[PDB]
Design a protein around this ligand. Structure first.
Ligand SMILES: NC(=O)[C@H]1CCCN(C(=O)C(F)(F)c2cnsc2Cl)C1
Ligand SMILES: [Zn+2]
Length: 139
């Protein structure tokens, strides 16, 4: 559960995208687990334009926000799921912290804004799909 709303855009996990998201599709990237779609109401979230490696993420399965140190966006191997076969997912950031499948979509933030969304997890690790490079979300 969870999405980012910036201007006339809505970013979600591509594996959790709805029929409306696909019928108003702007861009989608299987290797990043991302999909952006068109909205009529204007969004108000600020996206970060930085290279921080500390922030705060929201965890639905614990109803608690947590502070984390996280890695730089890179190619990490992700286990086969009902949505994708075993593959390398690009632009992924890892941190020590609790996550369960229903937690995908929770936002990661630093003092500059929205950094990304929960996208992978397991064994006491949590993975975030980076969004700071998508400069067109602001224009
Ligand atoms: N980005 C991916 O390929 C996702 C697809 C859905 C499945 N993915 C997961 O990691 C998970 F839901 F099983 C999970 C398990 N414990 S915490 C999380 Cl998040 C990978
Ligand atoms: Zn930052």
């Amino acid at each position: 559960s969870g999405a980012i709303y910036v201007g006339n855009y809505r970013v979600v996990n591509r594996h959790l995208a709805t029929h409306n998201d696909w019928a108003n599709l702007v861009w989608e990237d299987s290797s990043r687990d991302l999909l952006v779609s068109s909205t009529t109401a204007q969004g108000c979230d600020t996206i970060a334009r930085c290279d921080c490696q500390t922030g705060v993420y929201y965890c639905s399965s614990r109803r608690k926000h947590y502070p984390v140190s996280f890695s730089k966006p890179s190619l990490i191997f992700v286990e086969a799921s009902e949505y994708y076969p075993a593959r390398y997912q690009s632009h992924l950031m890892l941190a020590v912290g609790h996550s369960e499948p229903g937690d995908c979509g929770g936002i990661l933030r630093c003092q500059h804004g929205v950094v990304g969304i929960v996208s992978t997890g397991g064994n006491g690790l949590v993975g975030f799909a980076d969004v700071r490079d998508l400069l067109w979300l602001d224009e």
